Amino acid sequence: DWGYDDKNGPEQWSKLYPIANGNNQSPVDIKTSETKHDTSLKPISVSYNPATAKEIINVGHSFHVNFEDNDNRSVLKGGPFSDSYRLFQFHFHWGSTNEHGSEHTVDGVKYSAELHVAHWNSAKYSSLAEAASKADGLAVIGVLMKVGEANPKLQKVLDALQAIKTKGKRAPFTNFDPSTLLPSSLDFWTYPGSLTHPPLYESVTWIICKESISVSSEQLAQFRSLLSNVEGDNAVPMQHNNRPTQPLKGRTVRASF
Ligand SMILES: NS(=O)(=O)Oc1ccc(NC(=O)Nc2ccc(Cl)c(C(F)(F)F)c2)cc1
Ligand SMILES: [Zn+2]
């Protein structure tokens, strides 16, 4: 039963999930001197319908904000893609202190947290479950979160956490467009990689934003005050859930800028 503690964490994942040591693993350190600018990359186009927001849930190691994905009301297009990708979820990763919480890094610099906006290829596949193990199945936008000014756009999300404090609690979460969380520039890096936790499928085209967004030290504390235990058990704060960076193994990170 995988997690982020010393016994079940990222260094132990390879035992039940050998793909952990694979050739398209994520996250990575983006070295800007080694990126290749690609003129064939189109701008990123997001069009999300706030009516597709459904539910927020505490999953023990993190929390997820899920979207209705029965149709193309909320889609990602452009960049490296020929196909439309359908929004299904956003979530975050964070660390035990402000110094290190992001998953991706840029020129060795660790940020305080990271936003993942996840999508599946509904042009080619019939469901998320089908798309999840396909090399071209998933598209994730990653946004680096730099500790600084409180981010007001995060506040509906953070305000919802009090209703999902312990593992398995879920609550309705509606009328929210997650494009409001994205930076104003959508200049990006792209590379072929993986889910950053088990089952670690190498099915993700990553879109990493060049511009960070802000988060306050107190907003980060709200993440870390979520509880990994079930109600009635001893409180176990969700202190961190970020994977270390993984070897590029010859992959090319492309820049849109
Ligand atoms: N961290 S990451 O890099 O963005 O990766 C993830 C992307 C989405 C999730 N969402 C879940 O609720 N869990 C979840 C669990 C297993 C699988 Cl197979 C998937 C799927 F997306 F592949 F289908 C999603 C979990 C991890
Ligand atoms: Zn993630």
Curated annotation (Swiss-Prot):
Signal peptide residue numbers: none
This entry carries the following GO cellular component terms, namely: cytoplasm; cytosol; extracellular exosome
Checking PROSITE patterns in the record gives: ALPHA_CA_1, ALPHA_CA_2
List keywords of the entry alphabetically: Acetylation, Cytoplasm, Lyase, Metal-binding, Zinc
Q: Which domain of life is it from?
A: Eukaryota
Q: What is catalysed by this protein?
A: hydrogencarbonate + H(+) = CO2 + H2O; urea = cyanamide + H2O
The record gives the effect of mutating residue 64 to R as: In variant Michigan-1; confers enhanced esterase activity and an additional zinc binding site
The family this protein is said to belong to: Belongs to the alpha-carbonic anhydrase family.
The molecule here is called Carbonic anhydrase 1
Originating organism: Homo sapiens (Human)
